[PDB]
């Protein structure tokens, strides 16, 4: 795929995610633990976008004849890149499940929530996520030639998709009890359609933007030299593009849905 299509998304995600980080840092109604995980997501998405954009630029140069360094340094640059990309991918997924777990605790542990999560525990969990993701990224890129790393990445994606689906279907199924109870109210002058739309626009975006890459991996392992699987693998670029489309579209579905953040958006844009 053309490098233009792949750098455009990087710049768009950089802009959106810097804006989200500012809107959380520059507002105090948005200092809850949830918005700390939204800011972690914004940082991780920002890094995926920019790290992939700069690889693309450097690949565009090395394969062309504009800038040539020997074999050892080409390899050494390449690695650093992939490394950053992997750390930021794992951080992005972990920061989606952080928001999901936070929402789940706020709903289903509603009356005890501030005995569970404070602002400091948010920072502890964020720092732990990023140290763990850095370790995983470096191990995964230095040991890429094995089956073992790719199985680890695949297992992480499936484990972290199962849990997100399970964390949101429960929330929607409870919201339906409440909507049914509102409906029974007399003189009801209330839409499960809203809940259905949100559940879809969260899970489906996650799945569409993250599942092709991991199917590519799980067919690289399984069936590497069969016509169907080979035709699937041959679309690595069309799967990386979806990975970055996730970065573009996460701020829409988490930050842009808050009324307070949409007010901070107006305040920031008028500066």
């Amino acid at each position: 795929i053309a490098v233009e299509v792949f750098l455009t998304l990087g710049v768009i995600s950089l802009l959106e995610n810097i804006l989200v980080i500012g809107a959380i840092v520059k507002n105090k109604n948005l200092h809850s633990p949830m918005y700390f995980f939204v800011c972690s997501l914004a940082v991780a998405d920002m890094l995926v976008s920019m790290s992939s954009a700069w690889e693309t630029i450097t690949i565009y140069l090395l394969n062309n004849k504009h800038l040539v360094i020997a074999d050892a340094f080409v390899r050494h640059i390449d690695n650093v890149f992939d490394s950053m990309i992997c750390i930021s991918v794992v951080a992005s997924m972990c920061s989606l499940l952080a928001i999901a777990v936070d929402r789940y605790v706020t709903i289903f542990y509603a009356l005890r929530y501030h005995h569970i999560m404070t602002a400091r525990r948010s920072g502890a969990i964020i720092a732990g996520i990023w140290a763990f993701c850095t370790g995983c990224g470096i191990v995964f890129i230095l040991y890429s030639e094995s089956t073992y790393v790719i199985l680890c990445l695949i297992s992480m994606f499936f484990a972290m998709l199962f849990l997100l689906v399970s964390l949101y279907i429960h929330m929607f199924l409870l919201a339906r009890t409440h909507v049914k109870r509102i409906a029974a109210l007399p003189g009801a002058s209330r839409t499960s359609m809203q809940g259905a739309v949100t559940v879809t626009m969260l899970l489906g975006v996650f799945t569409v933007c993250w599942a092709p890459f991991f199917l590519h991996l799980t067919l690289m392992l399984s069936c590497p030299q069969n016509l169907y699987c080979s035709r699937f693998m041959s679309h690595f670029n069309m799967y990386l593009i979806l990975i970055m489309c996730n970065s573009v579209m996460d701020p829409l579905i988490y930050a842009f849905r808050s009324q307070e953040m949409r007010k901070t958006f107006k305040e920031i844009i008028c500066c």
């Binding site: 992939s52 890149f81 990309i85 690289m220 670029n237």
Partner: peptide, 13 residues
Amino acid sequence: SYSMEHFRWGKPV
């Protein structure tokens, strides 16, 4: 040589 390519895990190993 070592042709560089998008991120990692692309061509079959």
